Scaffold this active site. Structure first.
Site: not given
Ligand SMILES: NC(=O)c1ccc[n+]([C@@H]2O[C@H](COP(=O)([O-])OP(=O)(O)OC[C@H]3O[C@@H](n4cnc5c(N)ncnc54)[C@H](OP(=O)(O)O)[C@@H]3O)[C@@H](O)[C@H]2O)c1
Ligand SMILES: NC(=O)c1ccc[n+]([C@@H]2O[C@H](COP(=O)([O-])OP(=O)(O)OC[C@H]3O[C@@H](n4cnc5c(N)ncnc54)[C@H](OP(=O)(O)O)[C@@H]3O)[C@@H](O)[C@H]2O)c1
Ligand SMILES: [Cl-]
Ligand SMILES: [Cl-]
Lengths: 214, 214
Positions: B127
């Site tokens: 990742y």
């Molecule tokens: N988890 C952690 O602690 C952490 C730490 C550092 C950084 N981050 C980063 O921060 C970002 C934002 O976090 P978050 O919690 O908002 O993540 P999230 O809730 O998983 O948001 C990801 C979105 O991406 C969309 N998606 C997936 N495939 C797609 C596609 N093919 N075309 C268009 N959209 C698509 C999903 O759509 P659906 O609604 O249809 O599923 C979902 O709405 C993450 O993406 C991650 O990389 C996370």
């Protein structure tokens, strides 16, 4: 005669490549994850064995080297995590290590499917993107590179005869792993192949002649 | 007031971001995979909905847009195949589409762990490499970019207060998703934040003041 580091030296193509390089007058240096793989790679043509891992510090592997061939890959049995970490990230680090050290000659073993990964089979698309992005890193580098994109690989015996293209409009054939190895060994010391990216299938033209015209 | 395409608009950060952008006077355009997600994103602040998929042709999504925020991600429930295809390859294509169209302003939602992915937890390393390589593609682009690297995300309520660094020597804190959204919305129209890459945790400094000093 070049000292050629073969990264991924225990793989099927790489193994044939050790012998092809040896019989061209080169000194193949096999890079392996564990020391026990070394004795048989020496039997297959390796001049030296270096024990190193693309996921750890492998810089020692690049000592006294004239050319690098990146022939490593995670394979269809490990996860897409390893496709990222080996085929892409591993290649990127091998390139950086070659630049760092001033090793000019770099041969990438890539794949067809990489010109347009989004048109490739969905089940393979992650692999095709990994290969593509590694190719692009090499193309942005300062290295004297050649990128070989074989078609679907087979385990038939060598025919010694291939077809090449910058990019085939369709792929209707395979290439033996023996013949990929032969192609790589043929071009490693060919200056006129520097900066060349091509796709390669089995076909009708002898490998020496194909390389002459690249 | 900018028309801001939010790629990944149904995600947890993105959802908060729609509201933050709206209340800053911007027009958030939510990109969603299916049309049924649209009505609630309009309730959360979206001015318009565009139905597009990063794995298909999504160029229509970029029509009449002033700024792009890449907030998409495969998540911990799909394979590492989708980390390659969404977080990395999807981002790369969004960048190319922004260049193609002449959309200058691009905000990447990245992650801490990306300065040195090989020192990160092995289970996360794929990742971290994906995020890193997407960041590097943006950094090589011609875009007026800002890269926001949040720490570990939490679902606590916003504190409104953060700490930033080009790179923290250790990470001993989290950041709420609300606050990440607030940070992004704060800087989208700030010219002085162009070309900036920074890490962001919850801390003690009000978000407006942190952005003033970036
Ligand atoms: N988890 C952690 O602690 C952490 C730490 C550092 C950084 N981050 C980063 O921060 C970002 C934002 O976090 P978050 O919690 O908002 O993540 P999230 O809730 O998983 O948001 C990801 C979105 O991406 C969309 N998606 C997936 N495939 C797609 C596609 N093919 N075309 C268009 N959209 C698509 C999903 O759509 P659906 O609604 O249809 O599923 C979902 O709405 C993450 O993406 C991650 O990389 C996370
Ligand atoms: N299959 C196809 O039809 C096809 C089509 C086009 C292109 N290709 C490409 O052609 C390449 C060569 O094919 P091949 O059949 O020789 O593949 P292979 O037999 O799977 O060779 C891969 C080698 O990579 C090594 N490796 C894995 N992880 C490593 C690490 N962390 N550090 C160092 N070495 C590591 C393996 O070591 P171990 O011996 O320890 O496992 C193995 O010896 C492939 O890598 C593939 O990308 C394949
Ligand atoms: Cl293709
Ligand atoms: Cl780091």
């Amino acid at each position: 005669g070049m000292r050629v580091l073969v990264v991924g030296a225990n793989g099927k193509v790489a193994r044939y490549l050790l012998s092809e390089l040896k019989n061209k007058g080169h000194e193949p240096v096999a890079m392996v994850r564990n020391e026990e793989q070394g004795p048989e790679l020496r039997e297959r043509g390796a001049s030296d064995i270096v024990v190193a891992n693309l996921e750890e510090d492998f810089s020692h592997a690049f000592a006294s080297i004239d050319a690098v061939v990146f022939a490593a890959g995670s394979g269809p049995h490990t996860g897409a995590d390893k496709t990222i970490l080996i085929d892409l990230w591993g290649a990127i680090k091998t390139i950086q290590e070659a630049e760092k050290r001033g090793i000019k000659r770099f041969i990438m073993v890539s794949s067809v499917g990489t010109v347009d990964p989004d048109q490739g089979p969905m089940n393979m698309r992650h692999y095709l993107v990994a290969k593509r992005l590694a190719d692009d890193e090499l193309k942005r580098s300062s290295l004297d590179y050649t990128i070989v994109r074989p078609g679907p690989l087979s385990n038939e015996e060598s025919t010694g005869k291939v077809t090449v293209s910058p990019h085939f409009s369709e792929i209707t054939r395979s290439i033996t792993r023996h013949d990929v190895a032969k192609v790589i060994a043929e071009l490693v010391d060919q200056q006129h192949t520097i900066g060349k990216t091509f796709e390669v299938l089995n076909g009708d033209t002898p490998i020496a002649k194909v390389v002459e015209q690249l």
